[PDB]
C-alpha cells in the first residue's frame, strides 16, 4: 500500500483494497420567480450632488445620490422560488483533482 | 471617554440664547483643570459646524379584532342559556318520555 | 462545452453498504449539521465527531466509513478547512463544505437561522475561468445553494457497467439495479426529467 | 398631580384597559374551544356508526 | 388546534419463519434469482426481516 | 380572585359552566379524513428488558453484568453504566434527532413451523384471537376465550 | 397577541405584548457624465469668439 | 411547510425533526416546479396561489394607492421573466385588467420649527413632532372629556398640503386565489441595450 | 459510468484517484498521533506491541 | 438562441461554449419542422411567432 506501489497497481489494472466516492459540484442557470407585497418597503430618497475630476479626454462629472430602505413588515413580505431551468453553465466531465 | 460623553449630549454653542452674563473676563486657559470639556480655538475652526442627528420614522401598532361567539358557525350546535346561580346546583336533571 | 468541474475522491472500505448511495446521502459517511439541537450548545461537535453515540440519521451504526469521519481521520486531515492543508491550491474543492464545521451562534432559533441561511448566499467558485478555481478576491455573485445547508449530495444516473446503462428498445434507459457484481444507481437528483440522454 | 407622573398614570390606565379588553375577549374566544372539545369527546366514529 | 388529532397503528412482522412443509418451498420460475455458488444461498432458513 | 404575584397582583377570572346532551340517539359524528406527516420513526429500535428490577436473578453477579454488557453492545437505548441504585434507570440522553421519535419493537417468541399465511392479514400477536367483543350467554366468557 | 381561556390541567395564560425596533440601511446611486476638453474650451470663450 | 406544519411555534425535538424531514422532501420535490410540470396548468395555478397566500401582509397606511380601473386595490407584484410571463398569461392565469391607476406624487418630508431646533440642539428628531406633541398634550393636559380615548389608528391630524391624484397606466393585472396582483416581466423597459445583466 | 452535460458517456476509473491517494499526505500521521496522545488511555496489555 | 441566451454580447469562454452546445442541439433538432411536426397544429404556430 506504498504510494509508489499504489501507482504501479493503479497504472497496471490491479484493484487495491479500497474504494472511493467522487464529489462533483455543478452549476445551473435558473429563472427565478419573485413576489413582493404592497407595503413591503419604505424607500427614502435623498438629494443629488456632483463630483468633478479630470479624465484622459476632458473632465468627468460623477452624479451621486444617497438613499435608504426600511423593511416595515412584521413577518416575511417577499417570497421567491426557482421556476425554470436553462442550460447548465458547467461541464459534468471527469477532471480528477490534483493535490 | 467620559469627557466625550459629556460633550456628546447638548453640543457646544449651537446658537442658543445666553442665560446669564459672565463677569471677570480673565485668562481661562490657566485654570483649565476645572469643568469637564475645555476646547480653545485661535480664531475659527471647522468643527463648530456639525449637524448629524438621529430620526424616528414612525411607530406602528395593530389593534385586535374581537370575536363574538354568536357570529361563529359553531353557535348552531348549542342552546346557550344563562344561569347565575349555577354554583349551588348539586345535580340537575333532564327527562325524556318516548313512546 | 463549458467549465470543467473537478472531482474529489474520498477513500472508504470496499465492503460499504451500497443502499446508502441510492438516496440523498452525505459524503462524510456520518450525517452532521447545526440543524439538530434544542437541548444544549455544544451538540454540533458531538454530532459531527463523537463516535461513542450512534449516527443521527442511520441510527444503528456510528459511521458509514471510519476513514474520513473521525476527528483526525484521513479524509478529515485532507479536506477540512480548519487545518488548511490545501491552502496554496488555487482550485476549488467540492467537498470543502461537507467537512468544515461552520461558524455558529446559539442565540437564535433553528428555523429563523435556517431561513437566514436559505437566502442567495455568495459564490464559492469562479465563472470566467476554465478549471473551477477558488473564489477570486472580491468577486460579487449570489447563487441560491441547495444541499449545502442540509449537508447532502444527490446521486445521479450512474452505473458500473455501460451494458446495463441502456436497454434495447430505442427509447428509455435501463433500470435493473444489480446484475452479478455491478450496480446501477437510479437518479435521485432534482434533474429527473432534465439533462437529456 | 405633577406634569410628569400624569403621563405615566395615563399610560398605566391605558395598559390596564388594553389588557382587560383582551381578558374579556378571551372568554368569547374560549367558549367555541370548549364546545369543540366536548363535541369531539362525544362523537363516535363514522366507520363504526354507519 | 383540535381536529388535528393523532392515531396509533401497530405493525406486526414475523422474523425467523421457516416454511416447514416441503411442498410450500416452491419457485415460480427456473432462473428467478440465480447465483454463482454451487449451493443457492436462499434455501437456508431466514434470519431477518 | 385577587391573588398576589411576583411583581404585582394577579387577577384570575373564573366562570363556571355546564353542558347537557339533549339528544335521544347520537348527535355528533366524527371521521378522520386526511393524513399529515407521521410523528414517529419506523426504525429498528430493539426493546431492552434490562430496565426492570424485581424478577429472580442469576446466582453469579458477573454473569448478569457481562450479559447486560453484551446486550448493551449493538443497541440504542441502554441503562447507564454506573447502574444508579435508588433511581429510575433512565437511558442516557443523546444528541439531536433526525427523523422523529423512535418507536420501540417488542419481541414475542413463537415456534419456527408457524403458518405464514396468518401474518398476511390483520392478525393478533398473541397467537389466539381474543377480546370482549364475543359474548352472548354469560358474563365470564372473556377468560374462556382468552385463556381456556 | 390575543388570548384564549381554558380549564383542566393547563396553566392560565395572560396576554403578551411585543416590541420590535428596525433600523435603516443606507445605499447610493451613481452615474457618470463626461465633457470633452474641446467642448470646455468652446464654452469658456468669454466673449472672444 | 414551516408556516403550515408549525401552527404557532415552540416546537420540541420530535416535531422539529419531522418538520426537517418534510423540508428536505419539499426542497427536493418543488425545485423546478414550472419547467417540469409544464403540461399541467392546474398544478402551476395551485402552487402560485400558495406562493401568494403564504406571505404575511404589512402596515396599512396610505393616501393614494395602486388600483385597477374598477376600484379594487392591488395586493402586490409578481415580477417574472418574460418567458415565464408569456407561459403564465397564455393558459394559466386570467387577465383582470389592462390599465391601472398609479400615484404620481412622491410625498416629501422636511424638518422645521421644533424638529429643526431639536435636531440642531440635542441631536434627535421624529416624524411629525408637532402632531405627536399635540396628541400627547391633548390626551394629557385637559379634563376627562378628552383623556380616556387612545385608539390605535392612522390618526393623521392636521397634515397640511398634498396631492391626491392618479394617472391611468397600461399594465397587465392578473388574479390569483383571492388577491389581485401585478404581473411585470420588465426586460425591455429596463435592462435592455445596457451592460447590466 | 455516467452521462455528460450533452448526454455523452463518460468513465471515471481508479486511475483518476491517483492524484489524491498517491500524495505525500497519505503519510502525514504526526498530527493524528499528537491529537491521539492527549486523551485518556488505560493500561492495556503489551503482548502484540512489544 | 443567439438573441435568447446572451443578454447583450461579449460572453466569456464558458458562456460561449454552453451557447455553442445549445446551438448544435437546436440546429440538429428543428430543421425539418414542418414535415416532422405536421400532425400538431400548435407547434407550427408557436415557432412562426
Automatic annotation (TrEMBL), chain D:
Full protein segment contained here: 162 to 211 of 1396
Gene of this entry: ORF40
Highest classification ranks of the organism: Viruses, Duplodnaviria, Heunggongvirae, Peploviricota, Herviviricetes
The organism's place on the tree of life at top rank: Viruses
Protein name per UniProt: Major capsid protein
From TrEMBL, chain I:
Highest taxon above the source species: Viruses
UniProt protein name: Major capsid protein
Species lineage: Viruses, Duplodnaviria, Heunggongvirae, Peploviricota, Herviviricetes
GN (gene name): ORF40
Amino acid at each position: 500500500f506504498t504510494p509508489i506501489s499504489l501507482t504501479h497497481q493503479l497504472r497496471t489494472g490491479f484493484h487495491p483494497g479500497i474504494a472511493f466516492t467522487v464529489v462533483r459540484q455543478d452549476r445551473f442557470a435558473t429563472e427565478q420567480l419573485l413576489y413582493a407585497e404592497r407595503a413591503s418597503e419604505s424607500y427614502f430618497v435623498g438629494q443629488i450632488q456632483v463630483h468633478h475630476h479630470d479624465a484622459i479626454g476632458g473632465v468627468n462629472f460623477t452624479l451621486t445620490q444617497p438613499r435608504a430602505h426600511v423593511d416595515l413588515g412584521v413577518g416575511y413580505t417577499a417570497v421567491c422560488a426557482t421556476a425554470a431551468l436553462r442550460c447548465p453553465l458547467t461541464d459534468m466531465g471527469n477532471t480528477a483533482q490534483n493535490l | 471617554t467620559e469627557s466625550d460623553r459629556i460633550a456628546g449630549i447638548f453640543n457646544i454653542p449651537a446658537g442658543i440664547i445666553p442665560t446669564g452674563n459672565v463677569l471677570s473676563t480673565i485668562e481661562v486657559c490657566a485654570h483649565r483643570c476645572i469643568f469637564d470639556f475645555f476646547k480653545q480655538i485661535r480664531s475659527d475652526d471647522n468643527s463648530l459646524y456639525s449637524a448629524q442627528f438621529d430620526i424616528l420614522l414612525g411607530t406602528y401598532c395593530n389593534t385586535l379584532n374581537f370575536v363574538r361567539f354568536l357570529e361563529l358557525g359553531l353557535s348552531v350546535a348549542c342552546i346557550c342559556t344563562k344561569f347565575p346561580e349555577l354554583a349551588y346546583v348539586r345535580d340537575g336533571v333532564i327527562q325524556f318520555e318516548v313512546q | 462545452r463549458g467549465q470543467a468541474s473537478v472531482c474529489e475522491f474520498v477513500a472508504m472500505p470496499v465492503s460499504t453498504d451500497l443502499q446508502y448511495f441510492r438516496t440523498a446521502c452525505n459524503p462524510r459517511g456520518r450525517a452532521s449539521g447545526m440543524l439538530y439541537m434544542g437541548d444544549r450548545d455544544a451538540d454540533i461537535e458531538a454530532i459531527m465527531f463523537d463516535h461513542t453515540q450512534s449516527d443521527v440519521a442511520y441510527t444503528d451504526r456510528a459511521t458509514l466509513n471510519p476513514w474520513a469521519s473521525q476527528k483526525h481521520s484521513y479524509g478529515d486531515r485532507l479536506y477540512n478547512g480548519t487545518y488548511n492543508l490545501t491552502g496554496a491550491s488555487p482550485i476549488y474543492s467540492p467537498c470543502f463544505k461537507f467537512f468544515t464545521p461552520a461558524e455558529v451562534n446559539t442565540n437564535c432559533n433553528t428555523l429563523d437561522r435556517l431561513l437566514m441561511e436559505a437566502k442567495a448566499v455568495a459564490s464559492q467558485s469562479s465563472t470566467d475561468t476554465e478549471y473551477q478555481f477558488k473564489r477570486p478576491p472580491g468577486s460579487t455573485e449570489m447563487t441560491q445553494d441547495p444541499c449545502g445547508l442540509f449537508q447532502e449530495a444527490y446521486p445521479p444516473l450512474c452505473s458500473s457497467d455501460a451494458a446495463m446503462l441502456r436497454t434495447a428498445h430505442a427509447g428509455e434507459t435501463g433500470a435493473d439495479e444489480v446484475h452479478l457484481a455491478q450496480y446501477l444507481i437510479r437518479d435521485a437528483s432534482p434533474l429527473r426529467g432534465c439533462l437529456p440522454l | 398631580g405633577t406634569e410628569i407622573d400624569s403621563s405615566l398614570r395615563i399610560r398605566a390606565i391605558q395598559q390596564m384597559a388594553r389588557n382587560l379588553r383582551t381578558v374579556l375577549d378571551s372568554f368569547e374566544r374560549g367558549t367555541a374551544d370548549q364546545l369543540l372539545g366536548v363535541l369531539l369527546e362525544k362523537a363516535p366514529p363514522l366507520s363504526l356508526l354507519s | 388546534y383540535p381536529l388535528i388529532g393523532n392515531i396509533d397503528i401497530t405493525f406486526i412482522m414475523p422474523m425467523g419463519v421457516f416454511q416447514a412443509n416441503s411442498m410450500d418451498r416452491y419457485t415460480r420460475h427456473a432462473g428467478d434469482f440465480s447465483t454463482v455458488s454451487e449451493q443457492d444461498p436462499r434455501q437456508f432458513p431466514p434470519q431477518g426481516i | 380572585h385577587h391573588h398576589d404575584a411576583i411583581g404585582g397582583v394577579n387577577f384570575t377570572l373564573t366562570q363556571p359552566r355546564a353542558h347537557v346532551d339533549l339528544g335521544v340517539g347520537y348527535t355528533a359524528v366524527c371521521a378522520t379524513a386526511a393524513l399529515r406527516c407521521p410523528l414517529t420513526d419506523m426504525g429498528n429500535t430493539a426493546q431492552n428488558l434490562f430496565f426492570s428490577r424485581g424478577g429472580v436473578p442469576m446466582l453469579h453477579d458477573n454473569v448478569t453484568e457481562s450479559l447486560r454488557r453484551i446486550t448493551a453492545s449493538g443497541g440504542r437505548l441502554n441503562p447507564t453504566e454506573p447502574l444508579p441504585i435508588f433511581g429510575g434507570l433512565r437511558p442516557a440522553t443523546s444528541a439531536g434527532i433526525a427523523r422523529g421519535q423512535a418507536s420501540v419493537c417488542e419481541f414475542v417468541a413463537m415456534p419456527v413451523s408457524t403458518d405464514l399465511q396468518y401474518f398476511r392479514t390483520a392478525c393478533n400477536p398473541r397467537g389466539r384471537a381474543s377480546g370482549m367483543l364475543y359474548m352472548g350467554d354469560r358474563d365470564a366468557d372473556i377468560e374462556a376465550i382468552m385463556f381456556d | 397577541q390575543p388570548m384564549i381561556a381554558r380549564d383542566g390541567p393547563h396553566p392560565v395564560d395572560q396576554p403578551v405584548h411585543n416590541y420590535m425596533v428596525k433600523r435603516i440601511h443606507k445605499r447610493s446611486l451613481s452615474a457618470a457624465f463626461a465633457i470633452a476638453s474641446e467642448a470646455l474650451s468652446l464654452l469658456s470663450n468669454t466673449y472672444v469668439d | 411547510p414551516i408556516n403550515k406544519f408549525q401552527p404557532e411555534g415552540h416546537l420540541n425535538r420530535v416535531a422539529r425533526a419531522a418538520l426537517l424531514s418534510d423540508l428536505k422532501r419539499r426542497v427536493c420535490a418543488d425545485m423546478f416546479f414550472m419547467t417540469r410540470h409544464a403540461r399541467e396548468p392546474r398544478l402551476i395555478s395551485a402552487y402560485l396561489s400558495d406562493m401568494v397566500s403564504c406571505t404575511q401582509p404589512s402596515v396599512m397606511v396610505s393616501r393614494i394607492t395602486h388600483t385597477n380601473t374598477r376600484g379594487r386595490q392591488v395586493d402586490g407584484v409578481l415580477v417574472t421573466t418574460a418567458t415565464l410571463k408569456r407561459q403564465l398569461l397564455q393558459g394559466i392565469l386570467q387577465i383582470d385588467d389592462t390599465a391601472a391607476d398609479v400615484p404620481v406624487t412622491y410625498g416629501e418630508m422636511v424638518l422645521q420649527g421644533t424638529n429643526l431646533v431639536t435636531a440642531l440642539v440635542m441631536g434627535k428628531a421624529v416624524r411629525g413632532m408637532d402632531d405627536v406633541a399635540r396628541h400627547l398634550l391633548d390626551i394629557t393636559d385637559p379634563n376627562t372629556l378628552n383623556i380616556p380615548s387612545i385608539p390605535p389608528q392612522s390618526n393623521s391630524d392636521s397634515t397640511t398640503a398634498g396631492l391626491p391624484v392618479n394617472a391611468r397606466v397600461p399594465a397587465d393585472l392578473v388574479i390569483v386565489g383571492d388577491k389581485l396582483v401585478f404581473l411585470e416581466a420588465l426586460e425591455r423597459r429596463v435592462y435592455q441595450a445596457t451592460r447590466v445583466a | 459510468f455516467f452521462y455528460n452535460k450533452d448526454g455523452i458517456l463518460t468513465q471515471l476509473t481508479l486511475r483518476d484517484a491517483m492524484g489524491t491517494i498517491c500524495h505525500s499526505s497519505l503519510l502525514d500521521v504526526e498530527a493524528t498521533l499528537v491529537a491521539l496522545r492527549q486523551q485518556h488511555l488505560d493500561r492495556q496489555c503489551y503482548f502484540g506491541v512489544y
